[PDB]
Ligand binder design. Sequence first.
Ligand SMILES: NC(=O)C1=CN([C@@H]2O[C@H](COP(=O)(O)OP(=O)(O)OC[C@H]3O[C@@H](n4cnc5c(N)ncnc54)[C@H](OP(=O)(O)O)[C@@H]3O)[C@@H](O)[C@H]2O)C=CC1
Ligand SMILES: COc1cc(-c2ccc(C)cc2)cc([C@@H](C)C#Cc2c(C)nc(N)nc2N)c1
Length: 225
Amino acid sequence: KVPVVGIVAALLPEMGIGFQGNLPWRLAKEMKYFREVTTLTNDNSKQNVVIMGRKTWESIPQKFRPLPKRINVVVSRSFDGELRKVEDGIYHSNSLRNCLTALQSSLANENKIERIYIIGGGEIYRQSMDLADHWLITKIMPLPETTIPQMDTFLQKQELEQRFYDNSDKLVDFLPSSIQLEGRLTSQEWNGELVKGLPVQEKGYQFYFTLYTKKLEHHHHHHHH
Ligand SMILES: NC(=O)C1=CN([C@@H]2O[C@H](COP(=O)(O)OP(=O)(O)OC[C@H]3O[C@@H](n4cnc5c(N)ncnc54)[C@H](OP(=O)(O)O)[C@@H]3O)[C@@H](O)[C@H]2O)C=CC1
Ligand SMILES: COc1cc(-c2ccc(C)cc2)cc([C@@H](C)C#Cc2c(C)nc(N)nc2N)c1
């Protein structure tokens, strides 16, 4: 009932997302996008949830966690169960799946979560292909004289493009309405792939804000009593 949206910054063509527990770039504009998208709501009385694996949590600088103005959920298999408040702004869960079911109960949530953002990392994203309704992927490309950074963690692009289609034409409409983007929508070929979205450049990189949406499903079974 509440949308589940994975959100990620990935380097094309491998969709690399990390190296040695850290982001492989430092892009203030990309990070600003991430902040605004996850923080902002259309309804002023709601907040978003951000869910992340334990290793991702531990890599966020300590001055900046928990992420402000969002409900933070950290998942670890060594936590107690399925959704527990441990500090102001921090929930622990021992289960990505059960945590999502729990967050979705209108009795627990009072219909005051707008969206649930899944914010990483590799392990968590692997498991979220079947859980997310949408993906906000920042598609990052090294400009001509930019060294490709070393990377060790990757989005599952195969499974991605299996389950989802590039719905970037509807990106602007999908974002919370107060966000302001400086690009206009833009299709560009890059190493043999169509890259469609809203362009920025910063440091040695060009990047596009894109939206992926679940492909239409055939009606095989509805459960009847
Ligand atoms: N480019 C981007 O947009 C982003 C990139 N990243 C990158 O990803 C990398 C980190 O990814 P990765 O190492 O895979 O780690 P994760 O952040 O995905 O954390 C993995 C941990 O989460 C816990 N966990 C995983 N699945 C479950 C589950 N189903 N239920 C309960 N707990 C679970 C486990 O914790 P435990 O071991 O304690 O039991 C596991 O070791 C870093 O390089 C980081 O920079 C991260 C966020 C964004
Ligand atoms: C892997 O180490 C990390 C560090 C930070 C971080 C770094 C610096 C500061 C000042 C604040 C937070 C954030 C993250 C995670 C939570 C992220 C992210 C994410 C992004 C930047 N962009 C997009 N598009 N999606 C994301 N999930 C990880």
